[PDB]
Ligand binder design. Structure first.
Ligand SMILES: *[C@@H]1O[C@H](CO)[C@@H](O)[C@H](O)[C@H]1NC(C)=O
Ligand SMILES: *[C@@H]1O[C@H](CO)[C@@H](O)[C@H](O)[C@H]1NC(C)=O
Ligand SMILES: *[C@@H]1O[C@H](CO)[C@@H](O)[C@H](O)[C@H]1NC(C)=O
Ligand SMILES: *[C@@H]1O[C@H](CO)[C@@H](O)[C@H](O)[C@H]1NC(C)=O
Ligand SMILES: *[C@@H]1O[C@H](CO)[C@@H](O)[C@H](O)[C@H]1NC(C)=O
Ligand SMILES: *[C@@H]1O[C@H](CO)[C@@H](O)[C@H](O)[C@H]1NC(C)=O
Ligand SMILES: *[C@@H]1O[C@H](CO)[C@@H](O)[C@H](O)[C@H]1NC(C)=O
Ligand SMILES: *[C@@H]1O[C@H](CO)[C@@H](O)[C@H](O)[C@H]1NC(C)=O
Ligand SMILES: *[C@@H]1O[C@H](CO)[C@@H](O)[C@H](O)[C@H]1NC(C)=O
Ligand SMILES: *[C@@H]1O[C@H](CO)[C@@H](O)[C@H](O)[C@H]1NC(C)=O
Ligand SMILES: *[C@@H]1O[C@H](CO)[C@@H](O)[C@H](O)[C@H]1NC(C)=O
Ligand SMILES: *[C@@H]1O[C@H](CO)[C@@H](O)[C@H](O)[C@H]1NC(C)=O
Lengths: 491, 491, 491
């Protein structure tokens, strides 16, 4: 009238955070953690502390050959990736084609050292015209002009003597060398420009064995020209020489490029500002600080990135199902201001709440380990995802699409089910911890107290604050009170 | 003598449906659901409401050029995919080669609009022979003939003047244009056919810059010809012109094809009848209504398909382990005609079975949610799987095989373990629900009744049908009977 | 004083074997099994009972053409894969190129039958020089020499008549035929060697339609030659003929190769000894007997292999958490020398340990089934992983890298979490089995004994060894002792 009491119960709070499990939707929970990265900085950034190469309105081709309308950032000796606009304004001012263009973009995606040099001075042309090779297709300061890295040689007096030029690569580094051939409209143009009606370009290294022959066709005007310019490149290994021989139609090197190459990346299509940030993952829509194992921003990423996933939310339960003084069978305790599982007692020293420190620590460590495993076990490797295939490589681009789509389907499904399965395991862990605590107490107390059916025991003997602590400590001395208990019990 | 009784127990039935778990094989279960699609309709069907293109005995090449032995369905202005036989009877009647053939099949796999038109009338050949270009390799109505979409021009009198033809594309749509070159056997044939011993074909668009030259070799007879015909194509963008120039050996366009292209598919190898069905997934062996997330019919599918898996059965447990009146510790109740978990009682108003409505609904919703998650979380995207690589692309076909084989191994393993893990979780859920119901009752009754050890409680007081309902309702009033209970108990 | 007693408890031993779970690191456990293969035999071995082709210091090209410095194992009529060193010493002694080289290596990776034969005797050259075609680039026994499978024809007197040779393939098998063209340095060399200044090679089959033309360029010396030799191949189907015609610059077949092809493999880069072993999985670092579903040795494998994974350990718990006489609530029993779960009893016939045979068998079968599922459900297919793409195929090699890296990330993550999740399920199964055994006993004994709170019951009646067995058997007769129990109880 009335006896001393101890109750088992769990934490509750005012949280509205919701989570899904394999079996229940929209379960309200004490605390939750999102493992899906959804936030980008809306900028292009250095990658592992190396600037990109941003081509505002130029193609790689335009930029390499010196399309004179390409007003770009000139000096820039290394880069981690390249940014082009989808359809750049300035490409090949004089219409034509670039041989093995996509393989060269890929080779240039990421460069350790890049230094333009002069291999063949424009002034070294004594027996040909080095300053007439100019077109209204390639305008400079209003006047007709041409690509600035490469010379369109014309006949002098009425003569085009055979050209022979060797360049020996006396640098420490590989050289990227560029040249071209002119395909004219007809035999009149051919001889008006080069005198000789039948011409060739021959090029040789230790590797290269090339003979080019001009092609006449009747072609549509592009930039008001029916002619075409076709461009070619090689890498001249550090102790080799390249030997040019031509009769006509030769678009000669002036400037070449020293390059040092240490692994690849790709070409990103984006309209964004550079932003002086560093990052380990870049996206066409912005960079990411990538602690999380999953993201949903954009597929075409470069760096060490979370796995890309078709998903709005991946939320893990970390806390509990959120819902005298009755115990656990009736719901949670707002009064349990601290701890996850514990007690409410009432004796003659008064009443209150006490956390089970041991079982609460066990559980917080467990849930923290669960979240850290799901994050830390993720293998995260460098990759560069772009669209590097032209419109006669559609079968290979389709091969690339099945693979990308395949990994998206696998990661999306596996992340969704992983969250649903582990959410259900977590909520069931909390049920199992509460029920184990009740049994911890039931087994210590035996007949020295009575189960009230609501999560509480009423004692058959005076249990002061020290007896209470022994119960919470698992050190309750049953023999020391069996006598007193038995007397009140028999009655 | 004898006291009133309440028992906890679970549903049983006459089911022989078997399931596997991570720990036990061949467990008999109340109800189960297969998540592996195994049934096809044995037909080729429209795809998302668009007919295929079925080529009964023709190759794409034969069909485009008009091999005169190709007796196909003529009128057909759009299609979703193409069906060829493995080795079609009718290919190139006059032996030769088709330039970039596989890339063109891929481009034609799926077409929004397809309308043949005349660009160069057969009658517009005033100074050459338009009706002699005919071969016993290409038989029509018993008489010697040729491809019907393309003209084999021959010399007239003893003369082959230079041809110049422009066609300006004055249509709204892209044009697919086709032409060829004849490689003859020797210099006699060359001049017997074209008069001029040294010939070329030149072709120009805004894109194209082609010069073809015939090649003599000594070649084996094929369809009784040692000559070869080599074929070429381009897409003429809507405001461009194509310009032909030839000296000899020219196989001229007559008919070209207006095309509109909105995304790709592939070419399916199959021997099946069309069947007037629609579908969202087609297979070389039949279509599929694809609610399920997995199938085992065939890898080479087109559409939004289940994931392909090497597996005979993926069966999920949805029901229970299948096995006075004793309770749960002795097995299931055939008499529990309705509900999953519940009660059997006997008092002076009589005996019978009653379902625990609340815990049964909880569990049915849970299991239904589990099955719906495993199905609905599957990301399902359009894909087209074929064999599009020729016998000098074996390295790329091997790349495609590692990828396909890789996704099969991942999905097969993950589906098998997913079913085994969740089956074990489901059966353990049922054990946990039954044991919780027993404890729900044990905790309400306390000492007003005695545990019989078999899943039953014998009451120490008269419990009429209304007292019984309060127990099942969780509203049992212990104080209202503790008096009566205590008297029968002490004795 | 004192009463008979029965206790529930579990196996313990001196094991230090550690395991991780999703929630706890470094848990000590009774027994564990590694599912990660980490051991190789450091040798190259037959594959499914077929020898490899080991090229000690030769390239495939060198080996096919007969580079005279290639001192290899000569006779070898079938192989399962090819081994090259990274950069072989002996390649093309006379510098040049091999047309479609990588596709030919791939075709030759695995061969059912390989027999060299003579198609064109060196002696059958009556009107040309068959023994002058020799170079100081291609040294034999100190003297100048050449490739031994192929003849470098030179002019005789001062004449190079047109060559015409047919070879009809009168064998049962496909023929691999090899030829070349010589690109000389200048027009002097051209006529010094072949007399005729303007030359060609023409080659025809039912398939092939080739015309080769030599190319002059000014080229760097390689092996002290500025000339280049370019090589070509076809497969001559069993009833076809190949027809050669040349004017000059012809490197003629002498020997060709009968081949039978039944599926592909690849080319392995390795420095290892052959070792007379068989195997179903080979690695650049050694073979594997591949019972396990995962390995961490090397990615570039050939055969039916475990999945490659970035991981040091994948260890599964198979045993238990490892830790009067008190029962389970206080820890495990070293004395439980046999069985997993069971009993300790003490009556007047004496004390000791007894295994619960039924529940121990249930659990051992369960854990054995778990381990066997995780291993046996793995789909294991033939695959051949190499680096088959040249330095103008970098985009495709990058496509191959994303795919390989993608499957490594998926398998590594999924294996790690699979072990952590199932470890946690296994340890929780053991807790659940022990607690169920205690309740099995509590429910049989009811008030005929008292819970001591430590995992033990003290009986209220004499329980001899036969009464004890009925408890362990689940056949304990409560009525047969309720009388005796009640007397000692009331007191
Ligand atoms: C879950 O909650 C959201 C509201 O935030 C609601 O739109 C949704 O319909 C709820 N229920 C289910 C079953 O998804
Ligand atoms: C071209 O250059 C000068 C005339 O300015 C003359 O000496 C030379 O021979 C000229 N050649 C011809 C053939 O007109
Ligand atoms: C084709 O005709 C159109 C309309 O007459 C004209 O504008 C266009 O320039 C022509 N195309 C070419 C390249 O001549
Ligand atoms: C537990 O509680 C009792 C009573 O307060 C105290 O005397 C004892 O120091 C504690 N024992 C342990 C092992 O913490
Ligand atoms: C399971 O059941 C089938 C009979 O339907 C039988 O073939 C099989 O051997 C059984 N047992 C096991 C262990 O697979
Ligand atoms: C071919 O056509 C007619 C004869 O039918 C004649 O006028 C023409 O000049 C002929 N040409 C030759 C060179 O025979
Ligand atoms: C090769 O010889 C066979 C058998 O004599 C013959 O039937 C075949 O026609 C020949 N092949 C060619 C293309 O000449
Ligand atoms: C439960 O059962 C009792 C007894 O039949 C009934 O009076 C009461 O209406 C029910 N209570 C609830 C909350 O359903
Ligand atoms: C686990 O055990 C190893 C010693 O074998 C130790 O290096 C490691 O730090 C331990 N703890 C954790 C948290 O990894
Ligand atoms: C080459 O061979 C012999 C001389 O040994 C001679 O009969 C033949 O005509 C020679 N040809 C020439 C043109 O010198
Ligand atoms: C280039 O010059 C270097 C150094 O003078 C020389 O050794 C080398 O042979 C030259 N290369 C060629 C191929 O001439
Ligand atoms: C179990 O134990 C009792 C007592 O030893 C024995 O008589 C009986 O044969 C056993 N019963 C069964 C079903 O094994």
């Amino acid at each position: 009238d009335p006896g001393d009491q101890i109750c088992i119960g769990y934490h509750a709070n005012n949280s509205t955070e919701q989570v899904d499990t394999i079996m229940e939707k929209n379960v309200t929970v004490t605390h939750a953690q999102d493992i899906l990265e959804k936030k980008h900085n809306g900028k292009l950034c250095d990658l592992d502390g190396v600037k990109p190469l941003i081509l505002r309105d130029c193609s790689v081709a335009g930029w390499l050959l010196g399309n004179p309308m390409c007003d770009e950032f000139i000096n820039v000796p290394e880069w981690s990736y390249i940014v082009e606009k989808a359809n750049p304004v300035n490409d090949l001012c004089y219409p034509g084609d670039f041989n093995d263009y996509e393989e060269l973009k890929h080779l240039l995606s990421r460069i350790n050292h890049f230094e333009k040099i002069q291999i063949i001075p424009k002034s070294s042309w004594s027996s040909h015209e080095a300053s007439l090779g100019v077109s209204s297709a390639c305008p400079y300061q209003g006047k007709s002009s041409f690509f600035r890295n490469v010379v369109w040689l014309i006949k002098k007096n009425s003569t085009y003597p055979t050209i022979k030029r060797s360049y020996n690569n006396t640098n420490q580094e590989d050289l990227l060398v560029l040249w071209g051939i002119h395909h004219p409209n007809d035999a009149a143009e051919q001889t008006k420009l080069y005198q000789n009606p039948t011409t060739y370009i021959s090029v040789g290294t230790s590797t290269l064995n090339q003979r080019l022959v001009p092609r006449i066709a009747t072609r549509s005007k592009v930039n008001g020209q029916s002619g075409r310019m076709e461009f070619f490149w090689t890498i001249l290994k550090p102790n080799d020489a390249i030997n040019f021989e031509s009769n006509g139609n030769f678009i000669a090197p002036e400037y070449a490029y020293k390059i040092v190459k240490k692994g690849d990346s790709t070409i990103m299509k984006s309209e964004l500002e550079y932003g002086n940030c560093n990052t380990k993952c870049q996206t066409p829509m912005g960079a990411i600080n990538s602690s999380m194992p999953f993201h949903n921003i954009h597929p075409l990423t470069i760096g060490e990135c979370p796995k890309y996933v078709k998903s709005n939310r991946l939320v893990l339960a970390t806390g509990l199902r959120n819902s005298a003084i009755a115990g656990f069978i009736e719901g949670g305790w707002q009064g349990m201001v601290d701890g996850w599982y514990g007690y409410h007692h009432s004796n003659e020293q008064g009443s209150g709440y006490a956390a089970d420190k041991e079982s609460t620590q066990k559980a917080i460590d467990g849930v923290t380990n669960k979240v850290n495993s799901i994050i830390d076990k993720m293998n995260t490797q460098f990759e560069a995802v772009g669209r590097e295939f032209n419109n006669l490589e559609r079968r290979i681009e389709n091969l690339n699409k099945k693979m990308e789509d395949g990994f998206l389907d696998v990661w999306t499904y596996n992340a969704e089910l992983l969250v649903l399965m582990e959410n259900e395991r977590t909520l069931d862990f909390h049920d199992s911890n509460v029920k184990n605590l009740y049994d911890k107490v039931r087994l210590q107390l035996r007949d020295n107290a009575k189960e009230l059916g609501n999560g509480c025991f009423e004692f058959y003997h005076k249990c002061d604050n020290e007896c209470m602590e022994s119960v919470r400590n698992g050190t309750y001395d049953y023999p020391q009170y069996s006598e007193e208990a038995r007397l009140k019990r028999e009655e």
